[PDB]
Structures are given as structure tokens and as C-alpha cells.
Write a protein that binds this ligand. Sequence first.
Ligand SMILES: C[C@@H](Cc1ccc(O)cc1)NC[C@@H](O)c1cc(O)cc(O)c1
Length: 445
Amino acid sequence: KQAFLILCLLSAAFAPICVGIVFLGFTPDHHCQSPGVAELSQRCGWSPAEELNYTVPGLGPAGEAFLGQCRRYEVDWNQSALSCVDPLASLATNRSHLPLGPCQDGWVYDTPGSSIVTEFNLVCADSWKLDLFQSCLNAGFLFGSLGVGYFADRFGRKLCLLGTVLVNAVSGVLMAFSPNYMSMLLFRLLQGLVSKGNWMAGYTLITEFVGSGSRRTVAIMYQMAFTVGLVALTGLAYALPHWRWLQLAVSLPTFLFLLYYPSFADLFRTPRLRKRTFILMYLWFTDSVLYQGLILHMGATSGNLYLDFLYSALVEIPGAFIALITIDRVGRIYPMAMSNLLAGAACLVMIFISPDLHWLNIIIMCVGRMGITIAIQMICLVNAELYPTFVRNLGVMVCSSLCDIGGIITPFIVFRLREVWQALPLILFAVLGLLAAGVTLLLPE
Ligand SMILES: C[C@@H](Cc1ccc(O)cc1)NC[C@@H](O)c1cc(O)cc(O)c1
């Protein structure tokens, strides 16, 4: 009870770290700031959207909003010769011919809140530095998954866990006060180092305290605690429009936990075990890539982010309960295959739905998120029981590191590859899911 409560709290408090980029690092509509614009808007009395129409460059042919977002007319707005009705009509017959410069004078963001993007100006040529935030976090996970085993091998368990909790709490708080991007990424990285160590430690403790007659149940509980964490994060992000306030409020939960007081070659030597390991690695990679992929996509494209994220998080609960039934009554291999086929098909269909059908797109997104949630429940158990107890620890640690490599790769896909073609990420997610579906059928039941 008491211990189950602090471990579930630690799980719920992990979820804001993993997915916080969706709310701490949203990108609003933006355009080059300039002198004289506000003064001409006062003199003529422009309304906001009207001011945007007269001032900001046009979106251009069938797309190319980049030239509105990252460029401006090289025009002297201070000139009283400009017309109140339309200043650009005083200068060129076609608005395309005017000289375009970059946003050297800074940017204007349409939001009452703030995000790391809006604070550090992670837009245009800098825009990759946003995804680098999630890259640094997943690199933290990757290094920590190696370092924690050596630390726990050479330092006492209870002290190890208390240390990693303290480090996570303090680095999380300090990130809220970080004065520049590089310092922020160093706190992010350090938190990435300790976050997954804390999570897996709590999971180990809770699955040790509860016997196998209830272990599976308590594990699914622990997971639903992560879902509750996503819901709490959604409420906090709704109530707290500023990222710095959100980053404090996210970190203080951890202070309650404080206030409370072999042969790696073995995975590959045998060709059967080698093939099985490669499959399990692929499934882990694909599910991690799909889960972070869809969460980041949603955060990057959804128009009603708080509601879409709430619905999608709530949908994880039915998926967990369905898994809890299915593992016992039906099996694992065909369930995890159909759940990956369902996620892949959902990603495929999301390519063809016109974005105005948001009421349908959210349903397809929910079906996909349920599918991958079931897959994530199934894969943990299959990855565990397919390895003998002697090998289990090494195999889980290694395969769950491919999760983190996928988490390092995914941000560049979702935030950079999408710029080539908006559908492309969903094409990749479709291919990855459908292949993980097919490959799943090769595992023994
Ligand atoms: C990296 C991973 C750690 C991990 C390790 C071993 C394991 O069996 C399951 C998970 N946590 C984040 C994410 O992948 C995730 C999200 C979620 O909503 C539920 C999850 O279970 C996992």
C-alpha cells in the first residue's frame, strides 16, 4: 500500500519527463518582428489578422509557409509614404518581387504562454535544436542504462536509489532555472541518466514485493500509474500556461518521495537465440519509435492538443485492461501481432484522412495508441519469459536499450523528416508497424 503508493507516484512522475516536450516545447505561429510595424498599425488602426495580411509575406503557392515564418519584406515601415489601406500596394504590383530578409530583429509569437521554442527562438535554422532536447533525453536513458548496472554493482542498493532520486529531483528543478540552452541540455541529459534508473528500480522493487500470483496485475497497475501521470501532466499544462511554472510543478512531486523519509555473447552465439533476440530487439525498437512518434506527431499537428492528449491517454486504460484479460484468456503472440497490425493500419489510414476530419483523425489516433499500448504490455512479458532467468536481466537491459536508440532517432524523423513531406513520417510508421506485425508471427507461443 504505502510502498505501492510511492512507487506508483514515481512512475506517474516519470511520465512528465518522458513526454513533457509536447507541452514545454510547443511551437506557435510566428513571424519576423520588425520596427515601425506596431507604430504603423497604431497610425492606421490595423486589426491583428489584418495587420498580418498587410505585413507578413504571403504563404505562397500550395504551401511554403516557411517564407512567411522565416522571412520578412526588406521594407522601411517607418516611411510615412506607405499607404494605410495597403503599404505594399505603394511599393510593388506583385508582393513576390519585394526583397526578403531573415528575422534578424527577432520573432513575434502568437501565444499568451511560453515554451522553450518561444524563449530560446528554436525556430527556422535553429528548429532542429528543439528535437535535440528529446535526443539528449534519450541519450541520457541510453548511457544511464549502462552506468546504473555498474553503480549498483559497486554501491549499495538503497543508497543508489536514494541518490538517483535526489539527482533526478534536483536536476529537474534546476532545469526550470536554466539560463541558456546548453545548460538546459546538460540538466536534461543528467535527468535522462537517472530517470530510467529510478523507474526500472521501482519496477524491480514492486515486482519483487508482489508474488507471481499478482505480479502481472501490479505491473499493469504500475503502467496505469504512468497513464495517470500523463493525465496529471495534461491538467498541469492546461492550468499553467508557462513552461517554467510547469517544470517546477512537474519536479516537486519527486520531493514527496524524498519527504516520505554475464557473457554478452550468449545472446548471439546460438543462431536460434540470436534470431529471437533480433526479433525482440526489432519489436522493442518499433514500439518505442511508434509510441514516441505518435505522441510527438500529435503534439506537432493536433489543433486541440489538451483534449487530443487527454483522450489518447485515457484510451491507454482500455488497452491495458484488454491486455490484462487477453494474456490470460487468449495468449500473447497473435494478440501482439494484431495490435501491431492495428497500429500500422491506423498509421496508414491517417495518411489518407483529410485533416479537416479531426473528429475522425482523433479516433484513428486513439485506435493506434490503444494498439501500441497493448503491444507495449505484451512485449514486456514476452521479452521476459523468452529468456531464462540467468539470461533475462542481460537480455532485457540490452533490448530495452534499443528502445532508447530509437528514442534518439525518432525526434529527427518526426521534426525534420516531416519537413520534406507531411505524410512521410506516417509512411515510415506504417511500414515499421506492419513489418513488426509480420515479424511477430515468427515467435513461438
Ligand atoms: C523507455 C521505457 C522503459 C521500459 C523498460 C522496460 C519495460 O518492460 C517497459 C518500459 N519507458 C518509456 C516508454 O517506452 C513507455 C511508455 C509507456 O506508456 C509504457 C511503458 O511500459 C513504456
